[PDB]
Enzyme design. Structure first.
Site, PDB file in Angstrom:
ATOM      1  N   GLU A 258       0.789  -1.232   0.000  1.00  0.00           N
ATOM      2  CA  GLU A 258       0.000   0.000   0.000  1.00  0.00           C
ATOM      3  C   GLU A 258       0.816   1.274   0.000  1.00  0.00           C
ATOM      4  OE1 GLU A 258      -3.700  -0.539   2.014  1.00  0.00           O
ATOM      5  OE2 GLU A 258      -4.060  -0.182  -0.179  1.00  0.00           O
TER       6      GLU A 258
ATOM      7  N   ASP B 179      -8.337  11.210   1.864  1.00  0.00           N
ATOM      8  CA  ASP B 179      -8.591  10.042   1.068  1.00  0.00           C
ATOM      9  C   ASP B 179      -9.662  10.350   0.030  1.00  0.00           C
ATOM     10  OD1 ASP B 179     -11.243   9.826   2.234  1.00  0.00           O
ATOM     11  OD2 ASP B 179     -10.646   8.007   3.299  1.00  0.00           O
TER      12      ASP B 179
END
Length: 162
Positions: free
Chosen positions: A11, A20
């Site tokens: 990730e 986000d």
């Protein structure tokens, strides 16, 4: 080799607050700080969690600390999901990590949708599970990551992350 390191590779680690996709303030490896639109709120939370005035910046180890909490929360949730629990219970440690990796990436619901695969995993039919996993849309979307996770299911070792 551990799940933190696995996720850093897969990730990636961010050490400064960012928003986000949903627009939520986040840090480390997908650690959600808060759903409030306030950067002040985000910084505040970060400071509490780490016990120091970071000013929205963190260390690799504090990122780990936060991550380990997230791992606990993910398992908590898995154990409450009727579809996932049985699979998780049946897996060995390393394969458990691969499963959590998938949950981090696509959430419970996303994972629970790989019905056949999960059924195979449960029966320890490793090779067949890997095959089914490789033909999914997930594999096409993120082939490097998927390949590693699948290899992990297949062999039960950390070799792919070597």
């Amino acid at each position: 080799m551990n799940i933190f390191e696995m996720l850093r590779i897969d990730e990636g680690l961010r050490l400064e607050i960012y928003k986000d996709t949903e627009g939520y303030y986040t840090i480390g490896i997908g650690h959600l700080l808060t759903k409030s639109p306030s950067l002040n709120a985000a910084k505040s939370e970060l400071d509490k969690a780490i016990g120091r005035n970071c000013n929205g910046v963190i260390t690799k180890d504090e990122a780990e600390k936060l991550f380990n909490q997230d791992v606990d929360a993910a398992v908590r949730g898995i154990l409450r999901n009727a579809k996932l629990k049985p699979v998780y219970d049946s897996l060995d440690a390393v394969r458990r990590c691969a499963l959590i990796n998938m949950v981090f990436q696509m959430g419970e619901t996303g994972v629970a949708g790989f019905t056949n695969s999960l059924e195979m995993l449960q029966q320890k039919r490793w090779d067949e599970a890997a095959v089914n996993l490789a033909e999914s849309r997930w594999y096409n979307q993120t082939p490097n990551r998927a390949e590693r996770v699948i290899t992990t299911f297949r062999t039960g070792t950390w070799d792919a992350y070597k």
